[PDB]
Design a protein around this ligand. Structure first.
Ligand SMILES: C[NH+](C)c1cc(NC(=O)CNC(C)(C)C)c(O)c2c1C[C@H]1C[C@H]3[C@H]([NH+](C)C)C(O)=C(C(N)=O)C(=O)[C@@]3(O)C(O)=C1C2=O
Ligand SMILES: C[NH+](C)c1cc(NC(=O)CNC(C)(C)C)c(O)c2c1C[C@H]1C[C@H]3[C@H]([NH+](C)C)C(O)=C(C(N)=O)C(=O)[C@@]3(O)C(O)=C1C2=O
Ligand SMILES: C[NH+](C)c1cc(NC(=O)CNC(C)(C)C)c(O)c2c1C[C@H]1C[C@H]3[C@H]([NH+](C)C)C(O)=C(C(N)=O)C(=O)[C@@]3(O)C(O)=C1C2=O
Ligand SMILES: [Mg+2]
Ligand SMILES: [Mg+2]
Ligand SMILES: [Mg+2]
Ligand SMILES: [Mg+2]
Ligand SMILES: [Mg+2]
Ligand SMILES: [Mg+2]
Ligand SMILES: [Mg+2]
Ligand SMILES: [Mg+2]
Ligand SMILES: [Mg+2]
Ligand SMILES: [Mg+2]
Lengths: 137, 51, 76, 43, 115, 176
RNA sequence: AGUAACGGAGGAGUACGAAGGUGCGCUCAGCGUGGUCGGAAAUCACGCGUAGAGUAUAAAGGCAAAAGCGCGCUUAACUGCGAGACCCACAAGUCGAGCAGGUACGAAAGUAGGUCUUAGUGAUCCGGUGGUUCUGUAUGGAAGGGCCAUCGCUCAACGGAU
RNA sequence: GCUGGCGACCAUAGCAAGAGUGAACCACCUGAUCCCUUCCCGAACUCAGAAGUGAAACCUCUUAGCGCUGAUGGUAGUGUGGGAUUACCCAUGUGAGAGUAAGUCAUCGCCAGCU
RNA sequence: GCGGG
RNA sequence: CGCAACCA
């Protein structure tokens, strides 16, 4: 599962996930893409699982472009500790997902096999997704 | 550390200044020209032990 | 136990007199760490880069020079 | 040039071993006796 | 280029200080052939007086030495007093103060200019 | 001494013709010659520390300067501002004298001397030679010599291309 | 502007008579290309060079009139002050033009009341040392006290209870 | 019509690429005896000059290639009132950044000299 | 503040 | 290194 090789800071504020994804919202690396129409978090484990189910299905024909990278560390308190005593320990990494974000792109595969692969990947993710095609403006 | 020292006026007046000095990089007694306000004049102040 | 509990007291920096206000000589205009504002006419700078009015007048901020510096000046 | 800092450099005649007597202002303090020259070499 | 660029870098400090003092400036320029002096206002835009080795009184002679500089200094002192300019700040403009510049400045001090 | 008036009277028209330079001013001239002698072993002793300066003051008519170090390279065992070099810049009436006293009284004085290395121009008309010992110098004697070091020399000329530099160095009778 | 948490990160309890003042001068870091070892990375030369170097020291804000780097001479790391401000429960803290005296540097306009700034600190009590036509228990002295200068606290639980 | 100096203004002014200027001026230039310089060096600084050359440099022209400027519209955000609670919606006010069309190879002032 | 190293 | 002196 993906992870930054290094970061400036270990722990990070929680923040608010708000707004739409106007940046990573266009098919730019391949011909078909899966796009999140709902908001949430995407752990690195989910990214690995969805990539595995897509790649095993399309059977190595065509390239897969992972367009999300998990760069936000998430902490957790150990079990049976009270509420003070500093911030919890890093457990896993997530990517914040705004509606409109491209998650995976497939290049070099026909539409039906890629749509099968994307349907298989959607059942591994915690938000609703859609299948979008590359257009010209 | 730096030791405290007096710079006493060589004019007879009891006027002095206080400063610090590094005793290793400056073992000799400091001599410096300063204004004595009791005679209203620049004279030489020599180093002395803090009292 | 973690190792983060420290901070320093506030310093109360910033613009004290804004553009258009009247000043007298000696009035402090800007408390700043560096020179994000530079002294123009009738403005002096203290040892800690404090900008103060050296004359009566009104305060005026500008951007001047080829380095695009922010300048405070006092109009007499 | 600063005076009392540099070395002394006076005239100097150069006696080559192949009849090419030269003249140059150098700091040898004597008369040079050369064997090899820019005429008596394999250049 | 490099010479003029470095010399203007050398002049900037005195020029900015003279502007901050709000003073009438006696700016001098020196070329291998001529010398120039300008008495300039505190705002830096108006030339209150001027003199050079191009004056129909120094040009016909020889220019670019210490004697011509002394003559220019006398002439600028006179012309500056004519325009009611007494207290000035001397701007050597990145040139060393010694030499032809010093001759101009001494002739200007003896001419009546106060600095 | 000789080389200066020689270039002023003979080599000028020769270079202008051979190189086809229209303007008189834009003709290849020799501007400076700098003799550097890097000595990294400075903090270890004094023989090879002031010996380079003394060998220079003997070889070059002008005294040397002590090139310090600009940074602190750990693998090199140097710290910022420590004497790690020496240099001397011959400019005029001494640069031509050094060109003579090294090109006609000490040029062919090194053991097994092939012609030269003639592909060192630095994209312009500035050449850089090299030397392995000071024994070739007719000034430093092998009796008084000690802790043999070598000197690098660099001739900087007012030349544009490497061809103009090659011409200006040939007219002065280089080892090619 | 201020703003809490056993919230997230780091520093301090010094240094320096020059690393202060002033006048004068200077401009990096990185690349390419060449050159005795010498080599990716030392010193030399030449071309660029977008601020990416440096700053006694942590970070931030600054830094070309460089606030960065050198050389000469120096003691303004002065005394009496101080309009007016900032910040402040108080006690404290901060900046300060200008004025007088005595200076240093500069040809001169000028610039200097320490250091690029923001940490490098400790009240009061008790006592020590220097000075002092203030006082001096009948009087003259003295002791003692006062005043000005300064010294003695990981009083660190740092407004310090003995 | 050209130079010189000092400013305003700080890229619509800049880079890159071409091109031209020697009456004067400016630059390079000649030499350092003298005044001054170099942690070495007349390179720089300084002085005495006028045999050359506009080569380099400066300056002036030309060019949207890159920079820089830059709408309109839309979008994001947001004050107030209201409605929903995963961050939106409605009414009203405000309104970017980015990007697009387009614009840019400056404008102005005081003084002197030369044509 | 008195001796030892 | 020990013995002894400690009331900002
Ligand atoms: C108006 N701009 C275009 C300009 C004009 C001139 N020219 C003059 O004023 C004098 N010469 C003219 C009048 C043009 C003939 C300029 O001389 C300059 C500049 C720009 C500045 C920009 C500087 C800038 N920083 C230091 C504020 C900067 O970061 C850069 C850079 N390349 O990153 C600079 O180049 C800059 O330092 C600089 O050199 C400028 C000028 O010199
Ligand atoms: C050091 N100064 C003289 C300078 C010079 C040049 N250019 C050169 O050196 C020219 N290069 C040659 C040698 C001619 C090829 C420069 O190019 C620059 C600068 C200054 C810096 C200043 C920077 C500054 N901050 C970041 C330190 C800053 O805040 C500004 C600003 N305007 O606010 C800058 O402009 C700055 O970022 C900057 O760009 C500089 C230069 O570019
Ligand atoms: C317009 N300014 C902001 C500017 C920008 C750039 N561009 C960059 O450096 C871009 N670099 C990036 C990629 C953005 C990091 C620039 O590169 C430059 C300059 C300024 C010019 C000014 C030139 C000027 N002219 C008259 C020759 C000049 O005389 C000077 C001077 N007297 O200092 C210059 O500095 C100048 O030659 C110069 O170097 C500029 C730039 O290089
Ligand atoms: Mg800035
Ligand atoms: Mg300076
Ligand atoms: Mg810049
Ligand atoms: Mg008590
Ligand atoms: Mg009594
Ligand atoms: Mg008493
Ligand atoms: Mg307590
Ligand atoms: Mg407390
Ligand atoms: Mg709009
Ligand atoms: Mg816009």
């Amino acid at each position: 599962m993906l992870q930054p090789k290094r970061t400036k800071f270990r722990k990070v504020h929680k923040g608010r996930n708000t707004g739409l994804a106007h940046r990573g919202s266009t098919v730019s690396f391949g011909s078909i893409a899966i796009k999140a129409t709902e908001r949430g978090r995407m752990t690195a484990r989910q990214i690995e699982a969805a990539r595995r189910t897509i790649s095993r299905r399309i059977k190595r024909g065509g390239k897969i472009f992972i367009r999300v990278f998990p760069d936000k560390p998430i902490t957790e308190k150990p079990l049976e500790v009270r509420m003070g005593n500093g911030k919890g320990n890093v457990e896993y990494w997530v990517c914040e997902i705004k509606p409109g974000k491209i998650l995976y792109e497939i290049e070099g595969v026909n539409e039906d096999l890629a749509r099968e692969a994307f349907a298989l990947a959607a059942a591994k993710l915690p938000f609703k997704t859609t299948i979008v095609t590359r257009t010209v403006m | 550390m730096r030791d405290k020292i007096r710079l006493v006026s060589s004019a007879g007046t009891g006027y002095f200044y206080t400063t610090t000095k590094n005793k290793r990089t400056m073992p000799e007694k400091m001599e410096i020209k300063k204004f004595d306000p009791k005679i209203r004049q620049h004279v030489i102040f020599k180093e002395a032990k803090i009292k | 136990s973690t190792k983060n509990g420290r901070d320093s007291n506030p310093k109360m920096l910033g613009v004290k007199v804004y553009g258009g206000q009247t000043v007298t000589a000696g009035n402090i205009i800007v408390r700043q760490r560096g020179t994000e504002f530079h002294a123009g006419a009738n403005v002096g700078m203290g040892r800690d880069h404090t900008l103060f009015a050296t004359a009566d007048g009104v305060v005026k901020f500008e951007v001047k020079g080829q380095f695009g510096r922010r300048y405070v000046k006092v109009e007499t | 040039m600063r005076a009392d800092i540099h070395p002394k450099y006076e005239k100097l005649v150069a006696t080559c071993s192949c009849g090419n007597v030269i003249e140059t202002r150098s700091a040898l303090g004597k008369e040079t006796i050369y064997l090899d020259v820019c005429s008596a070499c394999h250049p | 280029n490099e010479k003029k660029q470095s010399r203007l870098r050398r002049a900037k400090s005195t020029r900015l200080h003279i502007r901050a003092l709000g003073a009438t400036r006696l700016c001098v320029n020196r070329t291998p052939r001529h010398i120039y002096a300008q008495v300039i206002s505190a705002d830096g835009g108006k030339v209150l007086a001027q003199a050079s080795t191009l004056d129909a009184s120094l040009r016909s002679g020889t220019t670019g030495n210490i004697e011509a500089a002394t003559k220019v200094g006398a002439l600028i002192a006179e012309r500056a007093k004519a325009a009611g300019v007494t207290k000035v700040a001397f701007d050597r403009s990145g040139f060393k103060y010694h030499g032809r510049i010093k001759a101009l400045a001494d002739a200007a001090r003896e001419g009546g200019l106060e600095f | 001494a000789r080389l200066k008036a020689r270039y002023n009277d003979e080599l000028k028209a020769k270079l202008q013709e051979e190189l086809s330079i229209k303007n008189v001013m834009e003709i290849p001239r020799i501007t400076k010659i700098t003799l550097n002698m890097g000595v990294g072993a400075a903090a270890t002793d004094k023989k090879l520390l002031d010996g380079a300066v003394a060998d220079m003051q003997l070889i070059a008519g002008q005294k040397p300067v002590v090139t310090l170090a600009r940074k602190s390279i750990a693998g090199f065992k140097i710290r910022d501002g420590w004497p790690i070099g020496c240099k001397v810049t011959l400019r005029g009436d001494q640069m031509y004298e050094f060109l003579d006293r090294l090109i006609s009284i000490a040029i062919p004085r090194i053991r097994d001397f092939r012609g030269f290395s003639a592909k060192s121009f630095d994209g312009r008309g500035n050449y850089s030679m090299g030397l392995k010992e000071q024994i070739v110098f007719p000034e430093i004697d092998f009796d008084k010599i000690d802790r043999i070091r070598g000197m690098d020399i660099t001739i900087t000329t007012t030349a544009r291309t490497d061809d103009e530099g090659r011409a200006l160095m040939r007219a002065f009778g280089f080892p090619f």
